[PDB]
Nucleic acid binder design. Structure first.
Lengths: 151, 208, 125, 138, 100
RNA sequence: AAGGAGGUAAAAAUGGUAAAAAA
RNA sequence: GCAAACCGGAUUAGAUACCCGGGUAGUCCACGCCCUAAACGAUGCGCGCUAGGUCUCUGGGUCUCCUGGGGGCCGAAGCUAACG
RNA sequence: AAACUCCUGAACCCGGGACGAAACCCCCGAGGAGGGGACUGACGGUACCGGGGUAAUAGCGCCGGCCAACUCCGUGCCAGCAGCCGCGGUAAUACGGAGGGCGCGAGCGUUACCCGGAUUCACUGGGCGUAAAGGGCGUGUAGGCGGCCUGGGGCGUCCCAUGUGAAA
């Protein structure tokens, strides 16, 4: 009931005295329109295998987001190796103004208005992960209390 | 110049029809009903994967097609939307419809957009007083847009009058069957008067 | 560059070395021309592709092609030195025009009228 | 030697958060006493105190550790997200009325020392002045 | 608003004329960090009331002469040397740079 | 010794095969 | 004693080379001149901070060990694109 | 879509028709402040207003990925294309042509030229184990930059009040 957007497949391969056996990966973002999301990277011989399976790795490996007023709370810089996703929440009238990976992940999330850039390696895999941790690392006033109340 | 020609050939191009040619393009076909789906050789081959940006682009086209105009001026006034503040695309749709041609349309004066442009451009439609030409003339909260002195003496004018009744105005377009007039009011939006195009997509595509 | 090195040195500007010494913003330069030749693109192709050695009104030769497919130019034409290479004819830049003071396109070009000459495929009949 | 003890304080503090270690030792100074005072009072650390190690008055700063999260291993969410030396001993980054930070487009925390004192972000705002922008934290 | 500068008097070298080693701080309209640089102006001392090193306050004056602008007024502190000393060292090291 | 590893040992009579190109 | 160049021998299609026999410059010492290098940890220096396990050069402490300086190895958290 | 059916009325005639100009000047009061009196249109019988009324120029680029738009002939590494990857070596969605579609619309494309993208001189915003890159090591001049207490100075630094930053 979520939504099963893909965002690229990989036509992998390995050689051997026996030709060159290909393979497939299925980068897939499944998010519930407004509330949560989840990423899944399929990895099978024939494509659709890896696609459905990817839907399921995504559906198992979820995570939700402080989707408030259509946006995210504070803003973050996330890095994965040489890949950096740059995220800043946006006042309405903005849009999911972002790349392909981001608008994928965040429209699957429910992010309505979002100022976002992407520095360093633009490798879609790592980038996607980076977005997923942008979600994974979002705090609010409430969250603040948990820590910044004092135990 | 408004494409001119196979118009409801786009009634099928976008996918879903629109109040376009008027009576017919709403009768048992906007060229639809009979066989709605994009024309051309590849008419029905097996619809491919529209790249996300292209869904967006097709939406832009969609909206400016129903609104009946080239995307030049449309571009300029979308920039005017960016500038004139408000949740851009909303007050955009508003300050799009505020344009006189389709003001005349939804006011129930003209049957169809093209017809509207004719009528207005020939000063058949007056605006709060002087017979304003210019299909592109935004009005203001209060102005009473009427017709011409020779319009009460005009024909399909009375057609429009009689055949329209039993149809309520866009909650700000306060007409007159009694004198052939029509006050302007508050700014409508996505819900005051709705249409089948997701605005956010349009704006996001446009300003890239 | 640790801030202080930045204060002294600073960092160096861009500089562009120009891809078209037709020069002085020359997108149409005089093309008077000489010779004809043949060439053969890095490897996997074949043809002839002119010479336009031009001389412009500035100087030098160059290798200006043509809009391909059937010439007309014998030795003049004032081909307006245009611009843009390709993985052939170790140069190709500064193209011929098809319009200019000669060439004037290919009769029967029911397409690229904007360039390859042709006023208008006026059927008449 | 040290070219800047204040930074060293902020950094050792980092280390503490990254190791999870009840409290850390720091050189006792007056300025940093003001700093860690702000830190404590502005919803953050667990406290400062005028302690002493071998003939040298030092300071023991207890670091706040949140609830034991789970999944694979706790790693109880860290009260000190991250700090940065804004006005480094290269950049005397001066801040004032329009020069005030924001941090975390909303919340966050930066502290700037001025003639009118060691004011917190919103504090420096609330009195309407400015001065050297020392360090930022989330 | 006759601009006045506070600077270290350098070299009594001329009669009725002193050189003045001024030095100003500045930011960096690109990189933030502060900087500093020396400027030698023309102190007008018609009776050699000034000498080696003694910081005085100099004045934006009538054009006294050829580049010789910037008189004096209020002497400040003497027994300076050390400053003028370092500057001197730097001068000798300017004569320590040769491609001949 | 079971392993990974840091220093000092042994170990080849011979040769030129081009290449536009398929999945 | 050795050892480029050089010669002769063996080798091969050829051997201006690898292997054998000889041999000079040099390799040595005084003074001077050159001032290059894979002059390599392929890692500028000085400082503070962050688990321990273990072999050992070393200085102190009556000493199963605590302790300050070293050269090795393994790995906390971390850090790298990966090896590391 | 067409032809047709009706409706209007680009153009274009007949008519009328400008604002753009009240001072200086003349007189009343003195030539003073104030009142009346009078000359002043290039633009152009154009803008404009009234009546009348004719269906009346549509083109350029794209359609292999980037990137929305595919089938058919000819051509067979020849002819060609090309911004980069490459496309043609006799079944080409790339070449020409043709149907159809995308786009744009009195516009369409080309080259040129600058800024962007390019966080590819990185100040927000970077790097130097093996990718471009640590000086062969020392030495130390200048410069850069500095531990901890106290108070004075208030130079940078922040703030307070104005002059100014003309118009555009």
């Amino acid at each position: 009931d979520f939504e099963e957007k893909m965002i690229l497949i990989r036509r992998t391969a390995r050689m051997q005295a026996g030709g060159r056996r290909f393979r497939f990966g299925a980068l897939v973002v499944v998010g519930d329109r407004q509330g949560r999301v989840g990423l899944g990277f399929g990895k099978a011989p024939e494509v659709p295998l890896a696609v459905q399976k990817a839907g399921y790795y995504a559906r198992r490996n979820m995570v939700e987001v402080p989707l408030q007023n259509g946006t995210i709370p504070h803003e973050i810089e996330v890095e994965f190796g040489a890949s950096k996703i740059v995220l800043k929440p946006a006042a309405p009238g903005t849009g999911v103004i972002a790349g392909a990976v981001p608008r994928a992940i965040l429209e699957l999330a429910g992010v309505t208005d979002i100022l976002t850039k992407e520095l360093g390696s633009r490798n879609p895999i790592n980038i996607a992960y980076a977005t997923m941790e942008a979600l994974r690392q979002l705090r609010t006033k409430a969250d603040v209390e948990r820590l910044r109340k004092g135990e | 110049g408004r494409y001119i020609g196979p118009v409801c050939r786009l009634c099928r191009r976008e996918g879903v029809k629109l109040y376009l040619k008027g009576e017919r393009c709403y009768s048992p076909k906007c060229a639809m009903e009979r066989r709605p789906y994009p024309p051309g050789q590849h008419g029905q081959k097996r619809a491919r994967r529209p790249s996300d940006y292209a869904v967006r682009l097709r939406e832009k086209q969609k909206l400016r097609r129903i609104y009946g105009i080239s995307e030049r001026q449309f571009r300029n006034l979308f920039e005017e939307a960016s500038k004139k503040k408000g949740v851009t695309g909303s007050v955009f749709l508003g300050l799009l419809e505020s344009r006189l041609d389709n003001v005349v349309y939804r006011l129930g004066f003209a049957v169809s957009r093209r017809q509207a442009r004719q009528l207005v451009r020939h000063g058949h439609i007056t605006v709060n007083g002087r017979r304003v030409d210019l299909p592109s003339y935004r009005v203001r909260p209060g102005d009473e847009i009427a017709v011409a002195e020779k319009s009460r003496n005009l024909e399909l004018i009375r057609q429009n009058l009689e055949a329209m009744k039993g149809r309520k105005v866009g909650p700000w377009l306060s007409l007159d069957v009694e004198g052939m007039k029509g006050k302007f009011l508050r700014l409508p939006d996505r819900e005051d008067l709705a249409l089948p195009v997701n605005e956010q997509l349009v704006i996001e595509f446009y300003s890239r | 560059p640790t801030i202080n090195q930045l204060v002294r040195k600073g960092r160096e500007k861009v500089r562009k070395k120009s891809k078209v010494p037709a020069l002085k913003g020359a997108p149409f330069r005089r093309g008077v021309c000489t010779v004809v030749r043949t060439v053969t693109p890095k490897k996997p192709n074949s043809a002839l592709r002119k010479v336009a050695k031009v001389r412009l009104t500035s100087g030098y030769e160059v290798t200006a092609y043509i809009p391909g497919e059937g010439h007309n130019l014998q030795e003049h034409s004032v081909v307006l030195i245009r611009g843009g290479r390709v993985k052939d004819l170790p140069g190709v830049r500064y193209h011929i025009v098809r319009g200019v003071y000669d060439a004037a396109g290919v009769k029967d070009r029911k397409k690229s009228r904007s360039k390859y000459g042709t006023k208008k495929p006026k059927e008449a009949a | 030697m040290l070219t800047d003890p204040i930074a060293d304080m902020l950094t050792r503090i980092r280390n503490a958060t990254r190791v999870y270690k009840e409290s850390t030792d720091v050189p006792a100074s007056r300025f940093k006493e003001e700093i860690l005072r702000i830190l404590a009072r502005e919803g953050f650390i667990k406290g400062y105190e005028r302690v002493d190690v071998d003939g040298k008055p030092y300071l023991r700063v207890y670091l706040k550790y949140g609830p034991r999260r789970q999944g694979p291993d706790p790693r109880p969410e860290q009260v000190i997200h991250h700090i940065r030396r804004i006005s480094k001993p290269g950049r005397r980054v001066y801040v004032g009325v329009k020069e005030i930070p924001r941090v975390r487009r909303g919340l966050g925390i930066a502290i700037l020392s001025t003639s009118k004192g060691v004011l917190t972000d919103r504090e420096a705002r609330k009195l309407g002045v400015g001065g050297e922008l020392i360090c930022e934290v989330w | 608003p006759k601009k006045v500068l506070t600077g270290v008097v350098v070299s009594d070298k001329m009669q009725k004329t002193v050189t003045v080693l001024v030095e100003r701080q500045f930011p960096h309209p690109l990189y933030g960090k502060v900087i500093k640089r020396s400027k030698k102006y023309l102190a007008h001392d018609p009776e050699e009331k000034y000498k080696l090193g003694d910081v005085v306050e100099i004045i934006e004056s009538r054009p006294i002469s050829k580049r010789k602008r910037f008189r004096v007024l209020r002497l400040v502190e003497s027994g300076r040397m050390d400053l003028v000393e370092k500057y001197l060292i730097r001068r000798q090291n300017y004569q320590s740079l040769s491609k001949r």
